[PDB]
């Protein structure tokens, strides 16, 4: 049974000609298997999303997007920690990675932030992250 690592590496592989649903979805499934999947999965995604290689970053955010839709409380709750959200902020701030990150990637992140503030009202740290970007001019 594929480790989360193996899985994420197939789903975000910069060699990929198209999106790989077998592995995007096997990743969401597997993270949901163990108590500790959600923290690990969230750690692995943050690294990939900060990749300087764009298709890596882009496929990573797809996986993020997918698992937020289909997974439950436990996932949503690891994502809506500042431990994870702060990593998404580093990518969109010019202060941090913002300046040599494509608009593609930064616009993807912001769009996801927004939809989860509407989709997931209870993840209140997500609201706060987004209001912070909004109030700073990034949004």
């Amino acid at each position: 049974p594929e480790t989360l690592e193996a899985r994420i590496n197939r789903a975000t592989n910069p060699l990929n000609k198209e999106l790989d649903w077998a592995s995007i979805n096997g990743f969401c499934e597997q993270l949901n298997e163990d108590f500790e999947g959600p923290p690990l999965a969230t750690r692995l995604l943050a690294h990939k999303i900060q990749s300087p290689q764009e298709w890596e970053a882009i496929q990573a955010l797809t996986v993020l997007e997918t698992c937020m839709k289909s997974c439950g409380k436990r996932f949503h709750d690891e994502v809506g920690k500042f431990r994870f959200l702060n990593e998404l902020i580093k990518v969109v701030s010019p202060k941090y990675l913002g300046s040599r990150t494509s608009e593609k990637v930064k616009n993807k992140i912001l769009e996801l932030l927004y939809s989860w503030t509407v989709g997931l009202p209870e993840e209140v740290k997500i609201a706060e992250a987004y209001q912070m970007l909004k109030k700073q001019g990034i949004v």
């Binding site: 923290p39 920690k81 500042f82 431990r83 959200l85 702060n86 902020i89 580093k90 701030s93 202060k95 941090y96 740290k125 706060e128 992250a129 912070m132 700073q136």
Partner: peptide, 9 residues
């Protein structure tokens, strides 16, 4: 586990 505090910026 904790968790962190929000960034400013």
């Amino acid at each position: 586990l904790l968790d962190d505090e929000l960034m400013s910026l």
